[PDB]
Design a protein around this ligand. Structure first.
Ligand code: K
Ligand code: K
Ligand code: K
Ligand code: K
Ligand code: K
Ligand code: K
Ligand code: K
Ligand code: K
Ligand code: K
Ligand code: K
Ligand code: K
Ligand code: K
Ligand code: K
Ligand code: K
Ligand code: K
Ligand code: K
Ligand code: K
Ligand code: K
Ligand code: K
Ligand code: K
Ligand code: K
Ligand code: K
Ligand code: K
Ligand code: K
Ligand code: K
Ligand code: K
Ligand code: K
Ligand code: K
Ligand code: K
Ligand code: K
Ligand code: K
Ligand code: K
Ligand code: K
Ligand code: K
Ligand code: K
Ligand code: K
Ligand code: K
Ligand code: K
Ligand code: K
Ligand code: K
Ligand code: K
Ligand code: K
Ligand code: K
Ligand code: MG
Ligand code: MG
Ligand code: MG
Ligand code: MG
Ligand code: MG
Ligand code: MG
Ligand code: MG
Ligand code: MG
Ligand code: MG
Ligand code: MG
Ligand code: MG
Ligand code: MG
Ligand code: MG
Ligand code: MG
Ligand code: MG
Ligand code: MG
Ligand code: MG
Ligand code: MG
Ligand code: MG
Ligand code: MG
Ligand code: MG
Ligand code: MG
Ligand code: MG
Ligand code: MG
Ligand code: MG
Ligand code: MG
Ligand code: MG
Ligand code: MG
Ligand code: MG
Ligand code: MG
Ligand code: MG
Ligand code: MG
Ligand code: MG
Ligand code: MG
Ligand code: MG
Ligand code: MG
Ligand code: MG
Ligand code: MG
Ligand code: MG
Ligand code: MG
Ligand code: MG
Ligand code: MG
Ligand code: MG
Ligand code: MG
Ligand code: MG
Ligand code: MG
Ligand code: MG
Ligand code: MG
Ligand code: MG
Ligand code: MG
Ligand code: MG
Ligand code: MG
Ligand code: MG
Ligand code: MG
Ligand code: MG
Ligand code: MG
Ligand code: MG
Ligand code: MG
Ligand code: MG
Ligand code: MG
Ligand code: MG
Ligand code: MG
Ligand code: MG
Ligand code: MG
Ligand code: MG
Ligand code: MG
Ligand code: MG
Ligand code: MG
Ligand code: MG
Ligand code: MG
Ligand code: MG
Ligand code: MG
Ligand code: MG
Ligand code: MG
Ligand code: MG
Ligand code: MG
Ligand code: MG
Ligand code: MG
Ligand code: MG
Ligand code: MG
Ligand code: MG
Ligand code: MG
Ligand code: MG
Ligand code: MG
Ligand code: MG
Ligand code: MG
Ligand code: MG
Ligand code: MG
Ligand code: MG
Ligand code: MG
Ligand code: MG
Ligand code: MG
Lengths: 56, 118, 114, 209, 123
RNA sequence: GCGAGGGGAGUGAAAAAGAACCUGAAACCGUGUACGUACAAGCAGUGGGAGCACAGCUGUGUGACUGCGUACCUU
RNA sequence: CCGAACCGACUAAUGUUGAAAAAUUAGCGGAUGACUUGUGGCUGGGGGUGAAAGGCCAAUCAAACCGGGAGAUAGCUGGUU
RNA sequence: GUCGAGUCGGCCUGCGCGGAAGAUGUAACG
RNA sequence: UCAGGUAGAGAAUACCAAGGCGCUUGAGAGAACUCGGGUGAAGGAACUAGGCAAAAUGGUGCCGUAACUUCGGGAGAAGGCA
RNA sequence: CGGGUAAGUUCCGACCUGCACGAAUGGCGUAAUGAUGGCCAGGCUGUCUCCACCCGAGACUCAGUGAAAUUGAACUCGCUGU
RNA sequence: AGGUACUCCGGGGAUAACAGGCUGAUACCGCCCAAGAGUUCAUAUCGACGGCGGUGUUUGGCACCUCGAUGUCGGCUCAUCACAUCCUGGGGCUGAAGUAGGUCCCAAGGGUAUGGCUGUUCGCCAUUUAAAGUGGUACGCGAGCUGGGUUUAGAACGUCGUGAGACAGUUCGGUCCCUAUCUGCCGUGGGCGCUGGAGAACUGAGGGGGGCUGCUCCUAGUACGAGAGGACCGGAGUGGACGCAUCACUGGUGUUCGGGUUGUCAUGCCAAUGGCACUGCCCGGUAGCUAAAUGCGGAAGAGAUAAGUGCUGAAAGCAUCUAAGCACGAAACUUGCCCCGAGAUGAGUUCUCCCUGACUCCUUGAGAGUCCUGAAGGAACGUUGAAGACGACGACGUUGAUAGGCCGGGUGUGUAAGCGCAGCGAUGCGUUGAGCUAACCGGUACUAAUGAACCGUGAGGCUUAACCU
């Protein structure tokens, strides 16, 4: 099965109207190190909820 | 449908799954913290924490059960000589999972899992 | 589950004797023929037991008039008037379905001495 | 005649003395609390709105809490309406118990059926399977033809096809009332009713009778 | 749970030894016959000097099945084989004079009382 | 990243002449602005035409609503 | 005679923009012989070779491939700014 | 015999009535 | 061309040695449907062009084995026991 | 016509009315052999009554890479008619 | 002079085979006349000789569409419509006593066999059923399956031919491709709208589903009938097929639970265990899913009617169901039952909740901007679910049982290991119904569900009525 007519650039854009990405609503701030981080994830320096959970 | 069913298939067959978690349980007992995918970490809790519960009562029969389930005498010894006593007064929840972003190679969601008194 | 537990507890029989797979039991059941009610005996080997509270059941096998017959009794049913063990059998398995392929000497069950 | 809102506790059996086992669905019917009365003048129709059960405060929004407070009743887990017959009257804040069904012989029970997700035509519509062997190529559970030819040149509306099955409102009619136990807030009906254990049920006196 | 092509043993002394169901009577598209149901049969094996002959077409009532019967309390009675009793094709009365093996109370009706009376045991 | 690529600086008449290098069309793909578009049925234009924006009543852009209207070639 | 290697190719499913321009998987036949295989040689296009199917002769066969006569001829189809 | 003012059936002719059932949807005034 | 161990008649087959590898996208989920497989109540070819496919049989020793026959066969006939 | 089946356009045995057999472009038989054609039976079964559940690989979601046939132009509904 | 089915090229829908179209001789179905048959009697039922139509269903005629391709017969799967009705429902006439029929009218709601033979459609046969309807839909349905038949290349028979070859004669064998753009259809979301915002409960325009029927018993061996036989009307019970739900029972599955066991490799060895061999092979089985399991359904009632039956009643002093007026009348129609449903843009209703700042600029208006403010609520994230392809939907987030673990129980398996005793030993016995036990039940903050941040605002146009101020 294949198209009988070439779809338009307009129809291509309409299909892609649901493809846009969503930015992260907001980042969280660690209460001890002050780092920003994804909520419920550890920070880049290894803090979570104010505690040094892992080295490096 | 999977109504009320438990356990993750993890795109493996049953013998692969069993062997994988036997190895991963050994790594967690040996190193006390490991990094893995978030779903594997959640499944590992149901393997490792009953091994620690078993190790609270030291007997020949229990050491043999633990050996049957880990196949590693260094792991069995650490379970009964160290972890059992460390957790003797804790009622479950010997591990904690900490989410840590996404793997570079395949964007897999990753997590650390560690013993709670590490 | 407390609501259904209470509803089930008040219906359970209190005098069910202990029996095991392999035992020979005699079960007395009520039979109605017109206005009359009488007890009919069914005696045979217990080949299966389902332990399930009020929903407990057990299966009895006998060779009757040249024909093998199995009856699955509902343990707490009022149709079952009484159960009594005639002989204690010594088997390993919980379910004795292999007896369905055996007759005569090959279907004998050793007695359990205790 | 109004109904009551209950919860599907599970199934069991009732042995009778004459040797019959009756399969029953156990329905817990706590007191239904009248939260609003609707009438012709204000609403254009006659009904009561009831609530039942309990809800934790911090999950009760302020709009919901104000509606319950106007009625003077504690928040329940939801709201349901029942149309009133001509000689039926109730007042806001009144409690209605399972004793309502004391002399009702048969009931209709409404619930949300268990969800099967996306279902094929074999399971959803009882379509027959095609050959397992005898040369069949990749078409063992597939639906077969779905129309005719150039006339009509389309598929008709309501054609039976694969799709979502279950997880929808279902009523089972004319179930025997086996026992009304007001002290335990219990209604026992003969047979099965829609929905999983723990789900909400609407019970009314049978419409056919 | 008897259907077209099911082979049955014979619980009487009519002479037939094996019969095959060729129709489940009593309704369009009716699938199964159980205990107490009438079927159409053909005789596939008979003893030499009996009352019926190989190849005869007649009726029978199912009296024992492996699927069994359920009783009003949920209990079950299952047999080791399927067996029937041959009936005259027009009067639906038994052809034999003796009944072998046990039968069940599902036959306790005006139609099959003779069978009930001759049976060595009624369950 | 002791990258790729780029921004400055400098050369040059010129660097949108920087080596993927004279000129640099079209299809095709973008960013910005003006107007239209989420109750509306078809060769998508044409005749009528409101409103809005813009530049100086007019010119330009857009085009709600409405009459009419089934591509081109070949055979 | 039964059965691996080896040589085949009877059935089915898959695959059919394949993993593959003929295969894979499960079964299947021969398996000391008119057997199978390596290396090298010989037969050439109205010709070869053929336990014969017009089979095969470099993924090509009721007359191979390449170059030439050559812009064969086309009362036919298309196209013609 | 009563009853007291119309009645009967041919012909020709205008317009209508029955005869008249079909398949995706009114669907034989656009 | 070479040819280890245990079982085995074996270069079949299963598990291993020496030795060599996990097949150059991964992570989740646990719908329909397709592919490759496992099990199935009662029935047992009613399926279908056709038992296609599937299921089944399956080893060694011993007992035993019909018509027919070109006297070789048929024959591992069949069937059974350990 | 007979046999087999509850029922047999096939099968087997006959009959002879051979449309249109016939004796080395051989006639009629024939043990053994055949991945050969037809028919019947026992065993066996998801072939089927009538499907159910399960284990895996896809399908589905996320990240990376990234095709194809087709295509006058499209603002690309039903019906009845034309 | 022939053959090509071993075939090839250029062309044609200028021209055949399939399907469509036009046509309707033929076919099928109605009707008109009434010779007669029917003891009598044309019309209960048939209807000769002839006559008039309807359908588009057969066999054909034509050659208008398609030859830069519109795939065939049958089966399978899935259907949808017509009514010229097979069953069930209603009725008139009967050469209708009853039972059972014949014929015609109304009626399309639902229902409407399994097998043997053959490629079959068909047909015959066996046995069912209330019945086994007739047709249209590309002789419905191969981008849904099959490929037995027809219709390529191999081979043979009969037959024809000197032969190559040929035969709607026969016989054995013989590759069925497509990842769906659009329409359509089944499901499921996102956007905006509905005029301040928000959380809920609804109304019901409209749409869909459903609608089948047997047998037995009572009425009653009554009515009817010489007997044989044997009812209407009405009532009760129990089935077949179909549908919906469910898992308490009976069971299937149960590669996540327990056990038996073959070969082998390993953990130093014994003992005990693990890997691999289809889950190695097996025996059981929890939750879930499920049918063969077991609950429930089709209605009653109402309205308006069809054919049909009437009442009163003139036109037409009679008669007349009709013209005025009035009444009955069926599974069809409109409701009653179940589900969807306000994108019902005609965007509806009800209840509740939230927001009561300052200033500036301009082209001066439903204008723009800054500062302050940020509600109700939402979303996001996390733990998740008998919810689920993804979205969606539901529960929960420390003021907490949402998930895992843990504790207790249940269930399943069937008496672990170790030690001891008996035995030469395999093994048996005791400790011991032991040990282990998934998805189950009841509990329990041990682990993970973070303080925040984000979106959403700041009293909501004009006109005219009414009411109050
Ligand atoms: K269904
Ligand atoms: K330049
Ligand atoms: K350029
Ligand atoms: K226009
Ligand atoms: K052209
Ligand atoms: K042309
Ligand atoms: K050689
Ligand atoms: K040649
Ligand atoms: K070549
Ligand atoms: K040549
Ligand atoms: K091996
Ligand atoms: K998924
Ligand atoms: K010759
Ligand atoms: K000869
Ligand atoms: K052969
Ligand atoms: K043969
Ligand atoms: K020629
Ligand atoms: K030929
Ligand atoms: K005509
Ligand atoms: K015509
Ligand atoms: K007519
Ligand atoms: K053509
Ligand atoms: K049809
Ligand atoms: K009728
Ligand atoms: K009639
Ligand atoms: K109908
Ligand atoms: K056939
Ligand atoms: K025929
Ligand atoms: K066609
Ligand atoms: K095809
Ligand atoms: K076809
Ligand atoms: K097509
Ligand atoms: K289209
Ligand atoms: K309807
Ligand atoms: K169950
Ligand atoms: K189960
Ligand atoms: K082992
Ligand atoms: K009258
Ligand atoms: K609305
Ligand atoms: K918990
Ligand atoms: K023991
Ligand atoms: K022990
Ligand atoms: K136990
Ligand atoms: Mg086209
Ligand atoms: Mg997209
Ligand atoms: Mg769970
Ligand atoms: Mg994957
Ligand atoms: Mg394995
Ligand atoms: Mg679900
Ligand atoms: Mg079928
Ligand atoms: Mg194929
Ligand atoms: Mg397949
Ligand atoms: Mg550089
Ligand atoms: Mg220059
Ligand atoms: Mg340039
Ligand atoms: Mg350009
Ligand atoms: Mg509208
Ligand atoms: Mg608009
Ligand atoms: Mg449009
Ligand atoms: Mg127009
Ligand atoms: Mg070859
Ligand atoms: Mg092979
Ligand atoms: Mg051979
Ligand atoms: Mg061989
Ligand atoms: Mg040459
Ligand atoms: Mg040839
Ligand atoms: Mg070649
Ligand atoms: Mg030549
Ligand atoms: Mg020349
Ligand atoms: Mg040329
Ligand atoms: Mg006329
Ligand atoms: Mg119509
Ligand atoms: Mg070896
Ligand atoms: Mg090997
Ligand atoms: Mg999934
Ligand atoms: Mg799967
Ligand atoms: Mg499969
Ligand atoms: Mg199997
Ligand atoms: Mg089975
Ligand atoms: Mg089993
Ligand atoms: Mg079985
Ligand atoms: Mg059998
Ligand atoms: Mg058959
Ligand atoms: Mg068939
Ligand atoms: Mg086969
Ligand atoms: Mg097999
Ligand atoms: Mg052998
Ligand atoms: Mg014959
Ligand atoms: Mg015959
Ligand atoms: Mg013959
Ligand atoms: Mg000859
Ligand atoms: Mg000759
Ligand atoms: Mg001669
Ligand atoms: Mg000759
Ligand atoms: Mg000769
Ligand atoms: Mg010869
Ligand atoms: Mg050979
Ligand atoms: Mg991707
Ligand atoms: Mg159309
Ligand atoms: Mg040929
Ligand atoms: Mg050509
Ligand atoms: Mg034609
Ligand atoms: Mg025609
Ligand atoms: Mg033409
Ligand atoms: Mg012409
Ligand atoms: Mg055409
Ligand atoms: Mg074309
Ligand atoms: Mg086409
Ligand atoms: Mg009609
Ligand atoms: Mg209708
Ligand atoms: Mg109706
Ligand atoms: Mg047969
Ligand atoms: Mg056949
Ligand atoms: Mg067709
Ligand atoms: Mg048709
Ligand atoms: Mg098609
Ligand atoms: Mg296809
Ligand atoms: Mg064929
Ligand atoms: Mg072949
Ligand atoms: Mg195909
Ligand atoms: Mg929406
Ligand atoms: Mg409808
Ligand atoms: Mg349960
Ligand atoms: Mg079971
Ligand atoms: Mg199992
Ligand atoms: Mg050992
Ligand atoms: Mg290994
Ligand atoms: Mg290996
Ligand atoms: Mg009615
Ligand atoms: Mg009158
Ligand atoms: Mg009805
Ligand atoms: Mg959803
Ligand atoms: Mg137990
Ligand atoms: Mg053990
Ligand atoms: Mg436990």
């Amino acid at each position: 099965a294949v198209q009988q007519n070439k779809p338009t650039r307009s129809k291509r854009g309409m299909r892609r109207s649901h493809d846009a990405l969503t930015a992260v609503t907001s980042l969280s701030v660690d209460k001890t190190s002050g780092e920003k981080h994804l909520r419920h994830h550890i920070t880049a320096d290894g803090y979570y909820r104010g505690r040094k959970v892992i080295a490096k | 449908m999977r109504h009320r069913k438990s356990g993750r298939q993890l795109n493996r067959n049953s013998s692969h799954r069993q062997a994988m978690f036997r190895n991963m349980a050994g790594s967690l007992v040996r190193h006390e913290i490991i990094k893995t995918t978030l779903p594997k970490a959640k499944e590992l809790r149901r393997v490792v924490e009953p091994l620690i519960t078993l190790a609270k009562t030291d007997s020949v029969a229990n050491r043999r059960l633990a050996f049957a389930r880990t196949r590693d005498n260094e792991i069995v010894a650490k379970l009964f000589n160290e972890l059992g006593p460390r957790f003797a007064s804790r009622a479950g929840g010997y591990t904690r999972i900490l989410k840590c972003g996404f793997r570079a190679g395949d964007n897999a969601p990753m997590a650390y899992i560690e013993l709670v008194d590490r | 589950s407390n609501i259904i537990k209470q509803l089930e507890q008040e219906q359970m029989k209190q005098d069910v004797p202990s029996f095991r797979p392999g035992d020979t039991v005699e079960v007395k059941v009520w039979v109605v023929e017109g206005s009359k009610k009488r007890l009919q005996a069914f005696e045979g080997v217990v080949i299966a037991i389902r332990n399930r509270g009020l929903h407990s059941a057990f299966t009895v096998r006998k060779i009757s008039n040249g024909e093998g017959v199995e009856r699955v009794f509902q343990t707490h049913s009022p149709v079952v008037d009484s159960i009594s063990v005639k002989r204690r059998g010594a088997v390993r398995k919980a379910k004795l379905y292999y007896l369905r392929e055996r007759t005569g000497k090959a279907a004998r069950i050793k007695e359990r001495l205790n | 005649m109004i109904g009551l809102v209950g919860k599907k506790v599970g199934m069991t059996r009732i042995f009778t003395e004459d040797g019959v086992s009756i399969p029953v669905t156990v329905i817990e019917v706590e007191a239904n609390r009248v939260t609003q009365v609707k009438d012709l003048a204000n609403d254009g129709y006659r009904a009561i709105q009831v609530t039942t059960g309990a809800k934790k405060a911090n999950r009760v929004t302020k709009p919901e809490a104000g509606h319950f407070a106007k009625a003077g009743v504690e928040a329940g887990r939801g709201l349901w309406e029942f149309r009133l017959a001509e000689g039926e009257e109730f007042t806001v804040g009144q409690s209605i118990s399972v004793e309502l069904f004391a002399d009702v012989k048969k009931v209709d029970v409404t619930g949300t059926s268990k969800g099967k997700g996306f279902a094929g035509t074999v399971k959803r519509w009882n379509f027959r399977t095609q050959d397992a062997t005898h040369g069949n190529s990749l078409s063992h559970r597939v639906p077969g033809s779905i129309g005719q030819n150039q006339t009509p040149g389309k598929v008709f509306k309501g054609k039976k096809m694969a799709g979502q099955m279950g997880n929808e409102r279902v009523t089972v009619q004319s179930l025997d009332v086996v026992r009304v136990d007001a002290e335990r807030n219990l209604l026992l009906v003969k047979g099965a009713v829609p929905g999983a254990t723990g789900s909400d049920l609407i019970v009314k006196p049978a419409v056919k009778a | 749970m008897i259907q077209e092509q099911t082979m049955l043993n014979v619980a009487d002394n009519s002479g037939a030894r094996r019969v095959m169901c060729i129709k489940v009577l009593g309704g369009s598209h009716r699938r199964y016959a159980g205990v107490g149901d009438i079927i159409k049969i053909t005789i596939k094996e008979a003893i030499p000097r009996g009352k019926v002959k190989k190849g005869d077409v007649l009726k029978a009532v199912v009296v024992r099945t492996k699927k069994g019967v359920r009783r009003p309390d949920g209990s079950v009675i299952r047999f080791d084989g399927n067996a029937c009793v041959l009936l005259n094709n027009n009067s639906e009365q038994p052809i034999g004079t003796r009944i072998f093996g046990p039968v069940t109370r599902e036959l306790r009706s005006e139609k099959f009382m003779k069978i009930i009376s001759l049976a060595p045991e009624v369950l």
